[PDB]
Scaffold this active site. Sequence first.
Site, PDB file in Angstrom:
ATOM      1  N   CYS A   1       0.862  -1.257   0.000  1.00 32.80           N
ATOM      2  CA  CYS A   1       0.000   0.000   0.000  1.00 32.80           C
ATOM      3  C   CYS A   1       0.832   1.212   0.000  1.00 32.80           C
ATOM      4  O   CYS A   1       0.339   2.241  -0.413  1.00 32.80           O
ATOM      5  CB  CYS A   1      -0.888  -0.103   1.299  1.00 32.80           C
ATOM      6  SG  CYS A   1      -0.113   0.050   2.886  1.00 32.80           S
TER       7      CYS A   1
ATOM      8  N   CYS B   1      -1.722   3.608   1.081  1.00 32.57           N
ATOM      9  CA  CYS B   1      -1.401   4.160   2.359  1.00 32.57           C
ATOM     10  C   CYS B   1      -0.126   4.966   2.282  1.00 32.57           C
ATOM     11  O   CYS B   1       0.633   4.901   1.298  1.00 32.57           O
ATOM     12  CB  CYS B   1      -1.335   3.118   3.480  1.00 32.57           C
ATOM     13  SG  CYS B   1       0.225   2.124   3.202  1.00 32.57           S
TER      14      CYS B   1
END
Length: 252
Positions: free
Chosen positions: A75, A157
């Site tokens: 991520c 992320c």
Amino acid sequence: RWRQTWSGPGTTKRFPETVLARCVKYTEIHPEMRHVDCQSVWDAFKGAFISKHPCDITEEDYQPLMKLGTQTVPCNKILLWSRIKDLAHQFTQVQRDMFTLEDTLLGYLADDLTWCGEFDTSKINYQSCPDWRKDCSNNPVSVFWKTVSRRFAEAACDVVHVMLDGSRSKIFDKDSTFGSVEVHNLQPEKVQTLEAWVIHGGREDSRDLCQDPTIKELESIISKRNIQFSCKNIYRPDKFLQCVKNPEDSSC
Ligand SMILES: Nc1nc2c(ncn2[C@@H]2O[C@H](COP(=O)(O)OP(=O)(O)OP(=O)(O)O)[C@@H](O)[C@H]2O)c(=O)[nH]1
């Protein structure tokens, strides 16, 4: 025939064989997808559009395919892009420093392809498919990219990067997949920073395009979602790629 039904290019030649082969190849190289049944992937891909009117496709249509193509992506190493996908892909190819959508099984299956069917026949339409402006935005190809892009953006992320084409009118284009779907589906709980790399086209010595109005708009949108924004110019993409391959080097 001298006039087609829709205004777009029709389904890519040998689409079913092309998609099947890509799936075989992807699942051979990427061990986390080693197990995927490629016939089934093709059957769920076909299910999304065949026998359906190609201006009435929904994200639901693609859910069988989405389930089958479920995949973990690191991520914190996501690279998004707008109108500069060759450089993005050349960059991630060097040493897999980041991952784009086309590094996932579904993005790799569909990249550069066009496809659409016919209402109530089970034929693939190889003659034309809807054009997003002229005919309809709810067509098989548009709806696929919006569906898979939103899931990819929801998976990011930490620091997410985006390459933008600084040779264009609208460096940040709110109509693009990145501006219309991905910017709005990054999760602020998870994403600290969106860092844009604005890729110059312009002969060597150039402006600080991080001051472009469209980049200020993007900063505003992102900052108001409680995500930090950073921007850098890449003035010479050829020098950048070289520095990525050989960082010890030559005035990197
Ligand atoms: N690989 C990939 N292709 C995408 C993505 N999003 C959209 N596309 C497809 O890339 C192709 C070209 O899109 P663009 O260059 O942005 O041009 P356009 O947006 O179609 O311009 P219009 O024809 O007026 O709608 C079309 O098949 C798009 O559907 C994506 O995230 N990744």
